[PDB]
Enzyme design. Sequence first.
Site, PDB file in Angstrom:
ATOM      1  N   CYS A 178       0.866  -1.148   0.000  1.00 26.71           N
ATOM      2  CA  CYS A 178       0.000   0.000   0.000  1.00 26.71           C
ATOM      3  C   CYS A 178       0.930   1.233   0.000  1.00 26.71           C
ATOM      4  CB  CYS A 178      -0.981  -0.067   1.198  1.00 26.71           C
ATOM      5  SG  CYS A 178      -0.297  -0.406   2.863  1.00 26.71           S
ATOM      6  N   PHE A 179       0.753   2.152   0.937  1.00 29.68           N
ATOM      7  CA  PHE A 179       1.681   3.278   1.074  1.00 29.68           C
ATOM      8  C   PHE A 179       2.804   2.921   2.041  1.00 29.68           C
ATOM      9  CE2 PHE A 179       2.782   7.374   3.184  1.00 29.68           C
ATOM     10  CZ  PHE A 179       3.471   7.934   2.113  1.00 29.68           C
TER      11      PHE A 179
END
Length: 241
Positions: A126-127
């Site tokens: 994801c981030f």
Amino acid sequence: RELPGAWNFRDVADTATALRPGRLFRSSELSRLDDAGRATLRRLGITDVADLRSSREVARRGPGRVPDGIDVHLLPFPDLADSINDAATRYMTDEYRQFPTRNGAQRALHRVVTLLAAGRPVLTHCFAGKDRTGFVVALVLEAVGLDRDVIVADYLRSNDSVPQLRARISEMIQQRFDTELAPEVVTFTKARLSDGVLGVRAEYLAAARQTIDETYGSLGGYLRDAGISQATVNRMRGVLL
């Protein structure tokens, strides 16, 4: 060990030693992968990436800078954006609590499982590679029969990356006129870059997991609702174990 230009990277099998190595990897975003990073992905034989970032995050940070021959699957999963840093703990717990019903969560889990069951080495990110990614990975591991303690061991490895995430955030802030900030950076900054927002805790993952039982009855019921058959789970278990 390393994936240059990314952080919080590991093979899940480094921790869950009953897994075959080289099947399921996890990391931060790949938007600043460099040449050495791209070569690392080729060397490891990763063919598929599951990019769980929200489309805002992808818009700002850019696409994963992967080598050719790697299929990046966009699987947006809403991000975690809007001394008592028990406030951070509450906030984060509540974010995890909502994970199972977020728009896109079932879609992401469905695609990750489907790819693994097909024998594709997959990197999920994801981030920060700790929350959304930690949720998806944890359900994958539980689906193939791993014990909670092993799942949590791998989940908590994201705490080791907290100094690197902090450095990355400071660099993003320095570059904020060149590249818009990911929304989580803003929220984490408000939370006074707490270890509670930059790290992870077993209570977060346990909140999400409890919500699955409360809403879907069980993990099996969640998987079924997410279009994941027992045939697919079985194939995934054979590929991973």
